[PDB]
């Protein structure tokens, strides 16, 4: 039995970043960059107007002037020089014609004379300064500037920067492919209606398929496997040979006489641990299998108890997926929060207590902060204790009652940007 | 020009939850439940062992006893009664045979005699209590108990609860379908290499496609549209008739003489506003179009400036997607944080200043909390100001320099569970 911090250190030490691949721009979203990106041209590549109005010679000052060209895009005004005593109409993003050194926004101007006559004239109502409302070449992005670097995760703004730079095929770290199976003679498919004696619906498999889909990985669903050593070996050898990077099993890892996951993983590879000092998730097995040519497969013999299964996925499998996906910060967000109710900590095993947390203007102490409500009874067989739980409170093994208003460390396990407000 | 709080109130008031649909279990992930879910049978549906060991009569106490059956799943031990003076082998999740009222874990037992002889005997090493290590029928979930309710978002634990309850087809609120187009004679596709005079790559479209994909919505990519009124009307009528729920355009909404988005939206529907008091995102247009039979289409005439485009998406479009998707808490997470450097606020427009935020053990004041670093120059044409930005600091329009260490409100715009730790 090892502490969770040691089990996390071992998993991290064995887990290796996947070889990079080339993907399309839309396939690059969510992925970590495996190359630096440089701008091939400046942004803007031409002097551009910040406003809809008139490009002027600043030194001319307020007065009435003829409009000698109109510049909105492309070759508009090419070969036209705005000389002292003239102006050019411009729209935002329009190229500044040669000779103009400032832009006066349309609100500080007035058109003079009849619009029907070909010759347009405008009254500039202010005294402007050279450079006003013009984006010089390269002011937003300089040519050859690094706009994105290796190790940076691609979100919407990063896709926008790749498009700005003309990069539609991107070198990234891929997501791992994950195989998932359930174990047990007592299991039936979740499509089962009336259950026969001693049967339960397989809930862990669909739960883990959903959890892995939330981490943006491809899933290989290997179904229900019975408590038969040859059958489980065949399905594990099949998963190892299929090209997946991670295998997730649940159940068949406790002290039962037909719990074959641990001895099969010892036979096929290297088991680093099979027991962890934690509440819930004690029978967790982690192993490294080498697939014959030629790559490493990580195997997590997750516990059968639904709560223990999901907590072990959240604490150990999520950072492993991220490490394989090239994240430099794979660890989960940890915050500090105040308890909204008293919670009794366990006397021997530190607890990952499920909570529903929210940000409050007053956390109970006068200042703003996160607050936590327990999900109730914490039994490892009670999947209702994971319902709506967006955090795991880290309760040390003291045996004391932590009173309402006391502060604890909490691992956030679900999208902080999808947190329901107070 | 209206304040952002009024623009958000108007958008919320017009936006209506989409009609619910029936989807498969894996399609239900991320979606909000449109029906309550009740357990059709209890969990466990039979008295189940919490441990691998022996089912006993508690009153028998420590002693040596014959093992009369073995119970791991299904019909194991059916018709066998554990009477006083006998025990039954059980594995975790195994049905408790009739007559046994407690379980003694295998660690508190010892097998006696030769294993080869058919008759097995075990020594129970402790005095147990009635009910120990047995999960009674329905202790985790009672039959007909409500396990999930209308308005609850489906995450991995909720998929696990649907599978437990045998629900593989779920009534949910769907995500809206979003049409996206760019406007401008100066735009070229992001596949363009060398740019001609007065051209830029279309970056907003791929950025908004990525942003909408992160919100789990289907995208209808309508491409680049030129600054031609008939062309833009045709593409808008096409989007309205196609069945999308939201149209996103960018550009063609400022004061230019070929900015046709506003007048086209006024003609096709009801424009609620076209100008907002905010830095960045001032030219935002919001309109409601009625598609002929027969449904409502929401249209956001987003600003062309890349920063303004993404900030307006993050503040106004993200809660609208969530409201249409049936979220009861569509608003973004707002927290309070301390500035890591000084920031000058604008004297007239309140600013959505881009920041990279992280949780620190000491936020600078001695206690733990969020801290923010600015992304630098905040110009609306500078997409590099959105790079890695996971929050928008809400700076009031005071004109004062907010010093390092002062606290501000911040909107979190990207997965809090994907936050890089300190
Ligand atoms: N799709 C786009 N990608 C990048 N920049 C754009 C896009 N559309 C408009 N812009 C720029 O945003 C600014 C305002 O656009 P508009 O509202 O059309 O005048 C101008 O500088 C445009 O060149
Ligand atoms: N796929 C599953 N879905 C729900 N419960 C399970 C699953 N697999 C195992 N269990 C339960 O978890 C507990 C421990 O399983 P095991 O480690 O196989 O003894 C037992 O009560 C099992 O019935
Ligand atoms: O042995 Mo556990 O910690 O109830 O899965
Ligand atoms: O007019 Mo803006 O607020 O630079 O898009
Ligand atoms: Mg089992
Ligand atoms: Mg334009």
Curated annotation (Swiss-Prot), chains A, B:
It comes from Arabidopsis thaliana (Mouse-ear cress). Catalyzes two steps in the biosynthesis of the molybdenum cofactor. In the first step, molybdopterin is adenylated. Subsequently, molybdate is inserted into adenylated molybdopterin and AMP is released. It catalyses: adenylyl-molybdopterin + molybdate = Mo-molybdopterin + AMP + H(+); molybdopterin + ATP + H(+) = adenylyl-molybdopterin + diphosphate. The G domain: homotrimer or homohexamer. The E domain: homodimer. Pathway: Cofactor biosynthesis; molybdopterin biosynthesis. Inhibited by copper and tungsten. Its cofactor is Mg(2+). In the N-terminal section; belongs to the MoaB/Mog family. Its EC number is 2.10.1.1, 2.7.7.75. It comes from the Eukaryota. The keyword Cytoplasm does not apply. Residues 4-419 are annotated as: MPT Mo-transferase. Keywords: ATP-binding, Magnesium, Metal-binding, Molybdenum, Molybdenum cofactor biosynthesis, Multifunctional enzyme, Nucleotide-binding, Transferase. This is Molybdopterin biosynthesis protein CNX1. One of its GO terms (biological process) is Mo-molybdopterin cofactor biosynthetic process. GO terms for molecular function: ATP binding; molybdenum ion binding; molybdopterin adenylyltransferase activity; molybdopterin molybdotransferase activity; nitrate reductase activity.
